Design a protein around this ligand. Structure first.
Ligand code: 1FK
Length: 116
């Protein structure tokens, strides 16, 4: 509360660390569905159905331009990619499988980096 703070966490490295994590997402073999925005002209339903489209390139641009105020806003965008993927794709599809794999991949790195 006013003049009562919990101990100051060192957040000075968060930007570098999220960048690193994103770089590792971008270079994963199953990242291909997520690298660029879904083309809303070419994928019927997507615009109407997916209210907040998100992809790795868009995240990279937001990250590099100071548009994440903190590491949690960054994790929210990453997860949004996978939540969108689940909304639009069958679990039993390459893309549905890619999304599950990448979420798992993300969450481990997230935990190892910031929890542990
Ligand atoms: C992420 C996603 O839903 C996605 C990703 C792709 C995609 N397809 C080919 C190459 C890259 N991404 C795609 C294609 C569709 N027809 C429908 C949905 N997607």
């Amino acid at each position: 509360s006013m003049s009562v703070k919990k101990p100051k966490r060192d957040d000075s490295k968060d930007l570098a660390l999220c960048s690193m994590i994103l770089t590792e997402m971008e270079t994963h073999e199953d990242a291909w569905p997520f690298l660029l925005p879904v083309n809303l002209k070419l994928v019927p339903g997507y615009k109407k159905v997916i209210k907040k489209p998100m992809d790795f390139s868009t995240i990279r641009e937001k990250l590099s331009s100071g548009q994440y105020p903190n590491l949690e806003t960054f994790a929210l965008d990453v997860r949004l990619v996978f939540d969108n993927c689940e909304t639009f794709n069958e679990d039993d599809s390459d893309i549905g499988r890619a999304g599950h794999n990448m979420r798992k991949y993300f969450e481990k790195k997230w935990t190892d980096t910031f929890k542990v």
